[PDB]
Write a protein that binds this ligand. Structure first.
Ligand code: 4F0
Ligand code: 4F0
Lengths: 231, 231
């Protein structure tokens, strides 16, 4: 069993990267993939860069070159659900694009032609993540994560997301791209991220301040989840 | 010399696909790549599907599996420059995302972190395209093409693009993703598309009506450009 892990930013992958034993580094297409064992389990960790296309490029390389059995997307997110504080965990049941609009041809808001309106995360990965949350006594929410190529910073950007996706629990910039690529290769995925900010007027200040705590909590979850999956 | 060609929709690749001799088909990651000779020149033609992530996935596969020397992105576009009529040609000097916004951290509107604000198309490919335009006596405009995951249909969507990118000559949904992937693999690209509509209130009706004429003119240009490049 080989577990693929994807994060966008150096801060989001560095704790996991550090823990990999017998680490090898592949540099291809402007991204880096680190392979080796994480507490005895074979992993391939991708640092993709930021946004949908960087994520899509990276995930495609990871799937082609490493053939992981499952994909876990880790990192930070902007919290939208009202019980989420900085550091808390979000688990995708589904991912949708908040910025896709082909409604002129009668597609659902957020849906691209040839795609389901939302990409569903794997039930067994969701269950395993929730059992880790329980075992670690973390506060978490499971539900819809939305992605786009924008950093949400209150004002009209936040308002549009709340209007179109009132059920969305978090927002970020890669998860749905990863989900889309996994869907097209028929590879199971789950998003397990942690809250850095609440996507409001203060989100730019909060992000800087609390990225480290978000990277720490998400990385703790990914470690626990990898161990759980290896059994 | 091997020329990579990318189109999103079946209508956009079918004329070229038909012309390929000794055609082989590769199916991978939900896309199709057709290889063989187009008027004697070795090509790899990708049908990607619609939008940024589908394009990014496809271009990554194409570059990895086929290693083309250059990439030509063909198909339809919404015309923004005032002298463009249906069927006319647009050539990218540059591609930018119209829907990317990380201005909260002081990136330029449309720029993603780790990327230039715009991706420049190859000068030699631009020159070769313009010489084909001349030889075919086509009406064309060269300049900025913007991409996003939205079909532009007048109203506020069009207004936002005209406001942020008044210099943009056309809008579509894949070109900048392709440019980004080419940038990260250091592969030259050019966008040569044709106008199907003017991205206004009528664009949904016009698109259906004139997709065929746009696919015909862009395909004629890609053929002429491939021949020109092979010399
Ligand atoms: C320079 S931004 C890179 C993104 C930041 N991280 C996600 C995220 C946290 N808060 C967010 C918010 N308010 N809006 C959008 N995205 C996020 C990781 C990467 O997706
Ligand atoms: C179901 S849409 C698939 C897109 C349509 N084609 C580009 C295009 C033409 N007119 C356009 C317009 N007004 N807004 C955005 N895109 C375009 C090809 C693909 O990108």
């Amino acid at each position: 069993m080989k577990i693929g892990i994807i994060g966008a930013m150096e801060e989001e992958v560095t704790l996991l990267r550090d823990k990999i034993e017998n680490r090898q580094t592949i540099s291809l297409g402007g991204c880096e993939i680190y392979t080796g064992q994480l507490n005895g389990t074979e992993v391939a960790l991708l640092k993709s860069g930021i946004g949908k296309v960087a994520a899509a490029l990276g995930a495609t390389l990871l799937l082609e070159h490493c053939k992981p059995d499952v994909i876990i997307n880790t990192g930070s997110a902007g919290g939208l659900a009202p019980t989420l504080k900085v550091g808390d965990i979000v688990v995708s049941d589904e991912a949708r694009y908040h910025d896709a609009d082909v409604t002129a041809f009668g597609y659902e808001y957020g849906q691209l032609p040839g795609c389901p309106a939302g990409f569903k995360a794997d039930d067994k990965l969701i269950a395993a993540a929730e059992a880790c949350i329980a075992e670690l006594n973390l506060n978490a929410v499971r539900g819809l994560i939305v992605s786009g190529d924008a950093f949400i910073n209150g004002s009209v950007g936040l308002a549009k997301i709340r209007h179109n996706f009132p059920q969305a629990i978090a927002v970020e910039m890669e998860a749905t791209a990863i989900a889309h690529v996994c869907h097209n290769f028929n590879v199971p995925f789950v998003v397990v991220r942690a809250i850095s900010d609440v996507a409001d007027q203060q989100s730019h200040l909060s992000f800087d301040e609390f990225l480290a705590v978000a990277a720490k909590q998400s990385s703790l979850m990914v470690e626990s989840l990898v161990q759980k999956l290896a059994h």
